[PDB]
Amino acid sequence: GYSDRARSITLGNSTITTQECANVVVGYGVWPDYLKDSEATAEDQPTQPDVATCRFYTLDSVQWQKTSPGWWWKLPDALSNLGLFGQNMQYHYLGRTGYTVHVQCNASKFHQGCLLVVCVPEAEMGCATLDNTPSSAELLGGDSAKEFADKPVASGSNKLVQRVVYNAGMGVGVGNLTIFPHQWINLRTNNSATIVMPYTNSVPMDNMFRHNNVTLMVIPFVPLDYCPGSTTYVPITVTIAPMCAEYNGLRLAGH
Amino acid sequence: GYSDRARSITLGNSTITTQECANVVVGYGVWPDYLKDSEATAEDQPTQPDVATCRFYTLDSVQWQKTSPGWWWKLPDALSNLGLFGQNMQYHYLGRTGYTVHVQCNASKFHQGCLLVVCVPEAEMGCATLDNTPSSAELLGGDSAKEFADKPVASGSNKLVQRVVYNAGMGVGVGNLTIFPHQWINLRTNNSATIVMPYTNSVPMDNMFRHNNVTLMVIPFVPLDYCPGSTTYVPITVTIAPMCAEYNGLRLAGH
Amino acid sequence: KVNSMEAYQIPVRSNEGSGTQVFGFPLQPGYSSVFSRTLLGEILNYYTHWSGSIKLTFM
Amino acid sequence: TSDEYTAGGFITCWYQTNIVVPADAQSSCYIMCFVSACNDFSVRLLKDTPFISQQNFF
Amino acid sequence: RVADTVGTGPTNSEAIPALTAAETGHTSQVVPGDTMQTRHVKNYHSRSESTIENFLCRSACVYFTEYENSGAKRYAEWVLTPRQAAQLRRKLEFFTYVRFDLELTFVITSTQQPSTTQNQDAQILTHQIMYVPPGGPVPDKVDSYVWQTSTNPSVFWTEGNAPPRMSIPFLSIGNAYSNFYDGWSEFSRNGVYGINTLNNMGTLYARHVNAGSTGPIKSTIRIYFKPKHVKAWIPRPPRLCQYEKAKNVNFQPSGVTTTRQSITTMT
Amino acid sequence: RVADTVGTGPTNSEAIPALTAAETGHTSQVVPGDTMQTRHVKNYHSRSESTIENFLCRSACVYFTEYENSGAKRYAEWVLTPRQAAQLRRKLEFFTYVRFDLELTFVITSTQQPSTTQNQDAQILTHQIMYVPPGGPVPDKVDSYVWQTSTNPSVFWTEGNAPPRMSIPFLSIGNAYSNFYDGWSEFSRNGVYGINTLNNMGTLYARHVNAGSTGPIKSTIRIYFKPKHVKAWIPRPPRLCQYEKAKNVNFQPSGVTTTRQSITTMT
Amino acid sequence: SITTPEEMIEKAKGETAYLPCKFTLSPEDQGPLDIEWLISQVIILYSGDKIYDYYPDLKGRVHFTSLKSGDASINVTNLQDIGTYQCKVKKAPGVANKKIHLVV
Amino acid sequence: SITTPEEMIEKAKGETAYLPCKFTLSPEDQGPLDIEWLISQVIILYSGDKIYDYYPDLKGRVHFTSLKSGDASINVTNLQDIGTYQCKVKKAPGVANKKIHLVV
Amino acid sequence: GAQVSTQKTGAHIHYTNINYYKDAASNSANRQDFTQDPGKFTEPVKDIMIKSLPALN
Amino acid sequence: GAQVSTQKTGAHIHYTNINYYKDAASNSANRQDFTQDPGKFTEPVKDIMIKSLPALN
Ligand SMILES: CCCCCCCCCCCCCCCC(=O)O
């Protein structure tokens, strides 16, 4: 006799354990697996480290203030410089992988807040200018937070990205973003959110450096509140774990 | 369908009931029983009250302050003046018995503290002087608290006992005192601690007045803390219950 | 702290940051000042070779 | 004994997030650590502990 | 023989082997395969050298004394007690009650002392070791009628052969030797407090059967204890503070451990 | 037992046992019967004395030291190492890894030193040999409490009997002793380079239990190693250059062999 | 084993000083009994079941309170006498001693 | 085992001379540590966890750079000082020594 | 009447022994007695605690 | 429990042995172990080379 609020996940040499949680969302009903022999196209044999990549990598934390719009991360770009996962994708031409997103935010009973955790495949984002397109290193961030911004970004001759939270940078309603696998963190109940995503693409394998399969978004629908005295610094932490990752086309390093 | 946090113990005409508890420790895996016919040495028949002694006796409470080192009690000496247990041991020459130690300390969610409850067999204690030995009525206390003392006791020509908490009066590490049956009271979770001890000695029966089988120790590893406003007076209470007690060698009263 | 009960305690608190270090020590069960005086460490001091796993429980 | 060929490793502890405390509660807490062996521990070569020291017959 | 490590894989479930309560004594019986992926590894390591018999059964000097062949100090005496030394005592004080047979060995060596006599051509020295039980007559001098050893066990040794060894059966009125006693010998609770009350092991006497020369000679005897057929009960923590006396556990308060520089320092 | 020679006759064929390629390692497995006519000869010679056990299992002195019974040098010490001598070391360095049990023998002899004291009538000397494991306490002086040998193995010997011999089990944390190590103990690769990094055999202490006289006496101890139950792997060429140090393979370049007069000279 | 071997007794002048040396003979100890009182050099001596009265200042002032039973205490008088008294009781197998410091 | 026991250091005048004697204690070696610097007769001495400042010319010039950790180097100054310095580190089971030649 | 037992060997031989005294406290020590039971010191509770389930539910 | 083996004699006798210790590192040496296998050092190739045939054809 145990409580469904307690969960443990073991991958590689890493573990996470939760005291309070909701459940696990499993993507589109699909658990990530390897590439079959009737779906593959590349001839040469794939490499599969199986343990040195498929573990938990913990990205930098972000402070949740009373006026934070939200944050976004590119899952392929985020683990580019972390561990052996980054090194394998650097040398190889083709990479295929799945992920899981455990987001942790812990607060006391007195603190009240709401966070939406959703994964968006092909989350193409628009530029502030209508004529030009968003520049790299402006949309992408290495282990970086990349927060949004209430109110429109000024229009001028600059490859700045439109960061409006209500349009989410894609021009769609922020509320309707529940169509993709989503989990809600309610400080009064849920402490963390777990999402498992299978590899989703229109091709069997893709170049990790020039294309991003999915974009993790954390958006506070209801702000953070408390009374004078309680702790003000409330951080959010994100851990990503590649699942059933395989690589092809070994060559000289670089991108 | 019940909760393992709730326990009830019935002995004689007495009962104790807990709303929050950890478990019951049962000594060295042995439940206390009576003396067999192949282990006994005395010829004359034993007396066994069975109800008038084997019940719960409640000793005086002790205030847990923010700077309390700890307390110790001798289980045979503590119940010497209480009820019929004291009267039976007074008249008789040989007494054999087992005990249980229910320690109760209740605090609110805001209060934070940690207490270690351990039973030490043959807990011989040292004197402040290296030449002489601890005097009685200095080591022993009748229904008395007998607290410890941070920092060494002064060395002089006096049968004072060394009360250092970190050496515990036996010259051994306070942390390693977990070798004997021990239970931890954590204010944030555990409210009380139950320990059952079988009779342990190198002989079948022993004179209760001149020898002490076990020493109960309560030591606050983590101090008591709270904020201005919460209740300051936080007491600890101890109840002992002799189990399967038998006596031999009836004679004139005294010691 | 070695002359006090404070040595056992590991102090944690609320800070305006994250990723700060709480503690750290090497894995030398018989020799490290941290483990030399524990039951297992004292037992090891009577032996030259040791081999196995090590459980660390935090309350 | 302290050796460099057979080195152990390092054991560290960091803040995964931050300690969250409400009002009228203490924000300075403590942790405690216990150490034990697993079911696969072994020892060899009985020797003399370096801790005890006797000046003269007591 | 030790247990062998098994092999586990990736796991996502409600099971929580790691999370537990240390409020209860229950020492977590978790293995590495519960918090990571492991490979199968057969373990041929054997828990053999750690048994109490292999731990305690080794000879250990407990007392060495001198005597002469002329003058005032002509024989030696020593009440049997293992608390004279520190190494044997600390090892035995891991447990509350012990029960073991004892193997006794002696090492007797002589030395010619400085003097001014001439023409010293010594002969071989013979030494007699005698045991007196709690209550037996004790020799007043070196030529006392006590040495007749009609019933007391004794041993004679001629300098130059293998040392003398004898085996002693568990001698006690109790059911186990007691390393620690919390109590008094007198009911009034005013007298000797401690193990001293329980101890009653008799006295040992050693001496020169013959002089052997005209010049002075000083002999020394070292006694070696070996516990055999050991049984032990109720373990207790090792001694931190250094020993002070042989009769009691009197100590001086000392640091719990040694100090480093910081809490994050690796040395 | 060795193979017996067979008998061949005259042959005219395309077979070419002699002609081969030494580019390949393939050591030609030809026998005399392939390049001449031979008679049948049964061979009762046996390859018995050449086995590694018969080669290595013989006692060999590895270190001899002195001590006194008065003055400053009162005891002797020596870290256990077989590289002190040359004969035992060269034989062991035919292989990369060896695994063997060790039989230890000691030879202790005393000598009366020149002095001017009078009336010296000495007694029999007893000597104590004590082993300290890597980490055990070491004796500061000759009357230190370390000699209590509660757990350290020790041996006592009275001058005049057969030497003392004890047998030691394969002591190593690895799976074989390593005669040669190419690497460092520190990862940064800046420190001790060589086998010295791997070696950890403890220290050996020898001393006089008693003085035995008024005049000076100097004792000497010689240690003898015998490898038993030997296993050996990966053979390597014998040492040409003479040894210089005990910690490393430092050498001075020398001639490949000795020189003659001509290339056709028979001497 | 003499109880409280290290002891300090403060007694006012003009009051007889009471010094107690109670002992418990060991079962192992079975020899002739000797009790000696030292003043730091002897004030009194008990040997071969005979009491001898050594110190000129304390002559006619030092006498035993009880010896065979196990009590070997003395009662001094006419204090002026500041010093340390060592009570040494001897049994052939084992020996014990207690030192008492007297002020004024 | 002191690394580079045979070493030669050429240092210009008016520049502090740095002499390094780093060592690695053996697991077998478990005794009191003594570090002695000889000038070929001592400039500095470390013994019983105490540093003593021996040579009149180098008085107030010779000081340690760090000892317990495993580094026993010195930093000399005001060179005029040509000589051979022998760093001798002592452990009760084993001993080692390093000689450094300094020119100008 | 001799007893034949096994010698202590490595992994991955028999020896003979006869008793010459009649005292039972003269024999050699008992070195080959490999029996353990840590369920007394470790896990000394009343209600059995399974590993996977929570401690306090 | 004694072991009877053969003595080393010339070509063109039995002896008895008993183990008196319980340690397996106390026994005598193993002198009669006559087993060879030089196919490792000599002939260390992949493709077997027959003697009569040419080495490189
Ligand atoms: C010449 C004959 C000599 C015989 C001497 C026999 C003396 C036996 C002494 C036994 C002492 C055992 C003490 C154990 C105390 C303990 O374990 O706590």
Ligand SMILES: CCCCCCCCCCCCCCCC(=O)O
């Ligand atoms: C009095 C007891 C003495 C016991 C001393 C035991 C010491 C054992 C030393 C073994 C050294 C073996 C070194 C082998 C090195 C190699 O083969 O390369």
